[PDB]
Design a protein around this ligand. Structure first.
Ligand SMILES: [Mg+2]
Ligand SMILES: [Mg+2]
Lengths: 360, 360
């Protein structure tokens, strides 16, 4: 039954890589359990428009006040209570996704299960940066293919695109191979991008401007390689518009980017209704955010491998107790209610740089 | 010659309405002159996505450190130096516009002149909120027609659209009449909006979602009244996309929304290349912002009246020494270099919440 949000903590941690990454956590408390989610916004607006400064101000100043001490039927009722404010999806997503965790934990059910998923393990691939040359690329790829990863994503740029791809393809003619074009191209480059076609990529991710659909639709008419949209899809209606236009045949679905789990479900179902698959994008998440991603990835139209690879690839030590490790390109769903993972509070304390508490 | 930016000041004021409005200012110092601009983002994200807290943290943590101490050839070079960041156009606009004012003042030239305009005054319109009934709407319109405004804008909403427009058009068969539909309709409302057609509105402003073009395109096919786009045109390429898709035939051009004067002139030119007019939109600006708008509005494709009405209608006392007052629907361009207006520093002091100075 119904749940009352009694308190909320905002905990910002700084986590060393292997220089650092800031992890904003929102914890909601209620009914003697808690829900946790992780912000994916950065200090500076590099991947998208939102920033830690603005999202946290929106949380303490607007969203938290609207929900604290209040009672709700479901996470959708929580999202509904955050008014008609424009944009700020990642901020909304912190509240919404923690609400999903909290709510699932009051029922004792795994998050994935509530969202309609029934996979017990999800397929994963890896994304690789730009390497120095054709052989160093192939070497780095081989390391990962020997780990069983089910898709390889290579960054590209002008004019480092056809070469990395052709080399990787010749050594490995059967792997699922993709590229991330990183919004570094123009309709001008349609000719170069078309050269990629003979290497049977599954898609080219977001080759043009990060906020565009119309030019993608045009570029898609000019090349045979499917395009995958990322930043240009921030909602189920964007997904609809993109697919009705022909701007892509694939969507990289990042839960926090679309404002959370429910909306991600809708994105997911709109894609399926068009016969377009989704796959789960990643963003250097701690185990909190990684767990949420895995649970969402259990939905059935997640038919291409996700960037939800092993935690130990990123951190010497994660913010949770449980390991999130994939073997042979498969990441098991972490057992337990909600996310199935648990904050390691002692370790979190040694890397916390800010913490605040909010009540009604 | 080139200009060095030696110092910047952020001053946030709470200026009394005729409740209160928070006015964030940026002051750029160099070559013995200064350039000033006004942020239009608000505390919470209601009109668009940016907030004062995100915007200001972006200025002091990223944009100002990038330009402080650097020497530039023109305002465009200043923009390019903030280069790689996404969205946040209003925050960007504070730097770029303050830069135009400074640049212009090192040259001794009025801002509008440098942007290519040659009007000495600009036509203004008036905006009427929702009134209680038809005759109250008509009586207010009658007042404003008599004061000499050259366009009437009626705010409409579902349940209250055809009625005020019918009544108004009936009493005033020839005036330039428009409506602001304020993103409150959906495609199911096409039949009701089509009923406005027989009243010869110059346009309906952004009836559907604030970030949409594709559905507006469809709505334009079902009714004959021209659509005017607002929040969904944030760049020159958005303008092109909107006009080419037939999402509208008019653009409400707001200088800060698109990233400042350079990009606004680009929106102005893309629109002109399609033969679509633009007009100057407003956001309850102090004299700083109003003066920038008035100078942008001197450009030749601003062929419909703008929301740069008298400052006295908004403020008991303005932040500038010069009064910006329209007479018979004509606002004079303020004389002098740059924006042609000058901060009243002692008055400003009495209304300053907060100030900060940054250097190298
Ligand atoms: Mg990517
Ligand atoms: Mg308007």
């Amino acid at each position: 039954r119904m749940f009352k949000i009694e308190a909320a903590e905002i905990v910002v941690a700084r986590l060393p890589l292997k220089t650092h990454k800031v992890v904003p956590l929102l914890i909601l408390h209620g009914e003697g359990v808690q829900g946790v989610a992780e912000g994916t916004m950065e200090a500076r607006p590099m991947y998208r428009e939102e920033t830690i400064a603005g999202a946290l101000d929106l949380l303490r100043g607007t969203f938290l006040p609207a929900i604290l001490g209040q009672t709700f039927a479901n996470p959708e009722a929580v999202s509904d209570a955050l008014g008609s404010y424009r944009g700020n999806r990642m901020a909304r997503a912190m509240v919404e996704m923690a609400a999903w965790d909290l709510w699932a934990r009051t029922l004792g059910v795994p998050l994935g299960t509530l969202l309609g998923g029934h996979k017990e393990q999800v397929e994963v691939g890896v994304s690789l940066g730009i390497q120095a040359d054709e052989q160093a690329t192939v070497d780095l790829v081989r390391r990962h293919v020997e780990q069983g990863y089910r898709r390889i994503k290579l960054k590209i740029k002008p004019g480092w695109d056809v070469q990395p791809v052709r080399a990787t393809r010749e050594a490995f003619p059967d792997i699922r191979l993709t590229v991330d074009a990183n919004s570094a191209y123009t309709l001008a480059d349609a000719g170069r991008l078309r050269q990629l076609d003979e290497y049977d990529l599954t898609y080219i991710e977001q080759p043009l401007a990060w906020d565009d659909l119309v030019d993608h639709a045009e570029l898609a008419r000019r090349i045979r390689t499917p395009l995958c949209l990322d930043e240009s899809v921030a909602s189920a209606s964007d997904a609809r518009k993109a697919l009705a236009l022909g701007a892509g045949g694939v969507i990289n679905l990042k839960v926090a980017r679309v404002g959370g789990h429910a909306e991600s479900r809708r994105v997911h179902d709109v894609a399926q209704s068009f016969g377009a698959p989704v796959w789960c994008g990643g963003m250097l998440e701690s185990g909190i955010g990684r767990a949420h991603n895995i649970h969402l990835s259990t939905l059935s139209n997640f038919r291409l491998p996700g960037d939800t690879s092993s935690a130990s690839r990123y951190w010497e030590r994660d913010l949770i107790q449980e390991p999130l490790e994939a073997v042979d390109g498969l990441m098991p769903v972490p057992q337990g209610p909600g996310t199935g993972v648990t904050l390691d509070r002692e370790f979190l304390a040694t890397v916390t740089e800010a913490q605040e508490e909010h009540r009604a």
